[PDB]
Amino acid sequence: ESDKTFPIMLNGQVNGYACVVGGRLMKPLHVEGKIDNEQLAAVKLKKASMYDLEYGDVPQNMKSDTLQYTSDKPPGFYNWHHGAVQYENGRFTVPRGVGGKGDSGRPILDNRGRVVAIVLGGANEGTRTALSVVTWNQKGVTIKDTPEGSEPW
Amino acid sequence: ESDKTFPIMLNGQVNGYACVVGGRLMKPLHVEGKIDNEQLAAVKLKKASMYDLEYGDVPQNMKSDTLQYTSDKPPGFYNWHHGAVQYENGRFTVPRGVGGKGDSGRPILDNRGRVVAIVLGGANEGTRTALSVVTWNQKGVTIKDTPEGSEPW
Amino acid sequence: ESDKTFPIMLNGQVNGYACVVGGRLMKPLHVEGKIDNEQLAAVKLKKASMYDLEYGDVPQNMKSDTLQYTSDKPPGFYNWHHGAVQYENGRFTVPRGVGGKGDSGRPILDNRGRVVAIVLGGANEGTRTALSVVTWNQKGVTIKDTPEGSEPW
Amino acid sequence: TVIVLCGVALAILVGTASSAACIAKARRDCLTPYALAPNATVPTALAVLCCI
Questions:
Q1: Residues C36-75 as b or e (16 or more Cβ within 10 Å = b)
Q2: Is beta strand C76-80 parallel, antiparallel or unpaired with respect to C83-88?
Q3: Alpha-carbon span A118 to A35, nearest angstrom
């Protein structure tokens, strides 16, 4: 997570976390800024606005060093830079108060060092916080799962 | 001083220093060079040319922690980067051979960690070197002090 | 060698080396990239295309601290970043297998710290690898010695 | 006659532009989910249809 998750910089503040997965860079559309890496600044970003994301092709040197896509998501605890995230009933939740603005684009990590979902926002429902994310599907479909009341961080 | 005083760089050489005091960034006019910082680079600089200075409103995210200033000037030793400046007879003096070109804009700090004056240049009088600086006053006034034979560093 | 030899960047990868000798900086022409040093980026390069080289006048603060040149070349072993190079029969050769693309412009040093030749390419004979380099002469003539089948690295 | 011919040309141009825009938007809609996921086992009818 520390090595291959690049913040987006703007006005001396970090606004998100662009992630390189499967040989392609991804950066959430809702956030704005510049990428610290010089190589990533030269990539053409095709915009999927319906999923609130843009994607581009990483260069040849960095293709081999990337996190791994996934499809299988058994319910349970999953890794995250701010701790652990609980997946149940097809929904992602975190302890109330953890995370916030500037954390969009952070990839949820699996036990084997594999990415499961990318954080877009969080909705506070009192007891916990439901994470509005983009998840994968068995047929390779990127479903944008956003619980009601989600706020794009 | 080390944390909140930013060198000024031109063509790969450090030629000046910009200071933050009271929530505002000052830079001097004789030296030309960029500021590596993004926010200060984005600050609009209101230029007082006869004061040989330009002042610009510091952004919000760093206005909370800024150098404090003072107008009371008891004579004696005042700490600074390469030692101490002796203040006497309404004049700042440093010993012969200390300081030079590129040290302009360096704040003169108080014992309680407060800025009292900003050095602009020096003049060699043989026994010592008299510092041409920008002293303040109790009546809300700022006075430039220079000697005969000024040399703006 | 490590201090005074710089890398050339091609999309963020090493592809050559630029050498400072006697106050002038040389760089192979066939290797395309940007010099890492910011100061050297502003140095104008005049090109000997037939020698596959470009040379320029280095700035004032690095010309003395340079790889001193020499012309006396008795046969035997000579220094090299990857080890030892054999100068025999007026030919520079290395063990077959060491060296390759991206090593062009590598300086070959002497025991006393002087430069004898600059590598441009190599050709594999099967037993050893003969290096197509530029060698100097007693009369101050730089012959581009290229064995048959040479490929620029 | 000049007015009628210009109107017909404008109608053809705007119709072609609208059809191209709708086809490209359909490509975006039906392709961008599969470009963000591995092993896009895509029935090739869509790509073959809207590639040209």
A1: ebeebeebebeeeeebbbbbbebbeeeeeebbeeeeebee
A2: antiparallel
A3: 17
Judge whether D46 is closer than 8 Å to chain A, CB to CB: no
Quick check: do C and D touch, 3+ CB pairs under 8 A? Answer: no
Please give, rounded to a whole number of angstroms, the shortest distance from the CA of A13 to a CA of chain B. 9
Annotated active-site residue A104? The verdict is yes
Task: State the resolution, in angstroms.
Answer: 3.4
Judge whether A82 counts as a catalytic residue.
no
B106-109: Cβ within 8 A, 24+ apart: B106/B5, B106/B17, B106/B19, B106/B80, B106/B81, B107/B1, B107/B5, B107/B19, B107/B21, B107/B67, B107/B80, B108/B78, B108/B79, B108/B80, B108/B133, B109/B1, B109/B78, B109/B79, B109/B80
Q: Which residues contact C67 (CB under 8 A, 6 or more apart)?
A: C4, C19, C20, C21, C22, C107, C109, C113, C114, C115
Of residues A103, A104, A110, A132, which has the active-site annotation? A104
How many angstroms separate the CA atoms of D18 and B43, rounded? 46
- The answer to whether B110 is a known catalytic residue is no
- What does the alpha-carbon distance between residue A127 and residue A135 come to, in Å, rounded to a whole number? 23
Q: Strands, E, within chain C: which ranges? A: 5-10, 13-21, 24-28, 34-35, 46-48, 53-57, 76-80, 83-88, 91-95, 107-109, 115-124, 128-136, 142-145, 151-152
Contact A108, A92 (CB under 8 A): yes
Question: What kind of experiment solved this structure?
Answer: cryo-EM
**CA distances, B35 to each of B43, B152, C13, D29 (Å):** 10, 20, 29, 45
> Quick one: A47 exposed, middle or buried, by C-beta within 10 A (0-12, 13-18, 19+)?
middle
User: What does the DSSP 8-state code read for residue D7?
Assistant: H
Measured between CB atoms, does C38 come within 8 Å of chain B? yes
Neighbouring residues of A64: CB distance < 8 A, sequence distance ≥ 6: none
- C-alpha to C-alpha distances, D35 to A57, A144, C47, D22, D30, nearest whole angstrom: 11, 14, 46, 19, 10
Please list, in sequence order, all residues whose beta carbon lies within 8 angstroms of the beta carbon of residue B81, skipping any fewer than 6 positions away. Answer: B1, B103, B106
Range list of H helices, chain B: 38-42
- Within 8 A of A59 by CB-CB distance, chain C residues are 11-12
Q: Out of A30, A81, A145, A150, pick the active-site residue.
A: A30
